[PDB]
Ligand SMILES: *[C@@H]1O[C@H](CO)[C@@H](O[C@@H]2O[C@H](CO)[C@@H](O)[C@H](O)[C@H]2NC(C)=O)[C@H](O)[C@H]1NC(C)=O
Ligand SMILES: CC(C)C[C@H](N)C(=O)O
Ligand SMILES: [Cl-]
């Protein structure tokens with residue numbers, strides 16, 4: 001049972017950090033990430049893409065001056081490893097930011113083309129960029145934030161939340177104190193929203209999540225995003241936040257749109273950068289940044 005701030009406590013600091021977000025870094029990383037034929041978790045393709053992604057995280061770390069920050073693989077029974085990047089803070093209360101790094105072509109999983117641009121390359125470059133900007137803060141890079149922050153890049157999500165299943169089950173066993181988890185899975189597709197004349201917005205998934213955290217998540221989107229929220233259900237174990245919920249951890253899920261307006265190109269060769277709106281991905285970078293900062297600096301957690 002975990003409770004959160006009623007309202008944002010570091011508006012000025014987060015707003016200044018938001019100005020450091022470089023919209024060009026999304027496509028820079030997303031373009032080569034989507035060039036792997038697929039990132040199938042059972043496949044050597046997914047192994048190679050995981051290693052490539054780990055290198056890109058490491059470059060952000062090496063370039064940051066943050067002496068204590070690490071990135072490590074998390075082996076699974078399949079070739080594609082998950083990746084956990086740790087920003088250690090004063091306490092062991094941990095804030096997790098999630099995306100999944102695999103992709104699938106449901107008609108030909110082993111060999112089919114799956115650029116996975118929106119599902120879920122968009123969430124990977126979203127939280128990778130918020131991670132980079134987070135380390136430009138002196139106290140965060142110094143390990144003086146009240147709480148620990150981790151960024152997770154889950155292997156094997158398209159096989160049934162396989163990587164996050166492994167990770168959170170093991171966190172549960174080793175008594176890891178995960179006070180808040182935010183999953184981001186598809187953050188780029190807005191053409192379904194705008195084609196219907198709906199205002200572009202941040203989807204907020206309301207099932208398989210924690211109510212208090214989802215409430216705080218909306219608080220974060222109102223302070224730090226310049227678009228509204230819309231509440232949606234998806235009606236099943238949508239994404240990796242369901243693995244966190246399964247082990248009693250408070251989780252939330254921010255989405256590109258209302259669930260019925262999301263990308264129809266996922267799980268096929270047609271999930272391409274063409275379908276991705278990076279100005280919307282930038283909005284998810286702002287809420288990721290703000291969520292991570294406000295909770296890293298929440299003493300009452
Ligand atoms: C957070 O701080 C910002 C300033 O960085 C406040 O900015 C308001 O909106 C724009 C910037 O987006 C400014 O030009 C306005 O002057 C501000 N409006 C008002 C009425 O002051 C923003 O209001 C702050 N947010 C909260 C929740 O306090
Ligand atoms: C985020 C949701 C649209 C579901 C997710 N794309 C999946 O792996 O099934
Ligand atoms: Cl609890």
Ligand SMILES: [Zn+2]
Pocket residue numbers: 119158266267
């Ligand atoms: Zn998917």
Ligand SMILES: [Zn+2]
Pocket residue numbers: 100119120157185186239
């Ligand atoms: Zn997905």
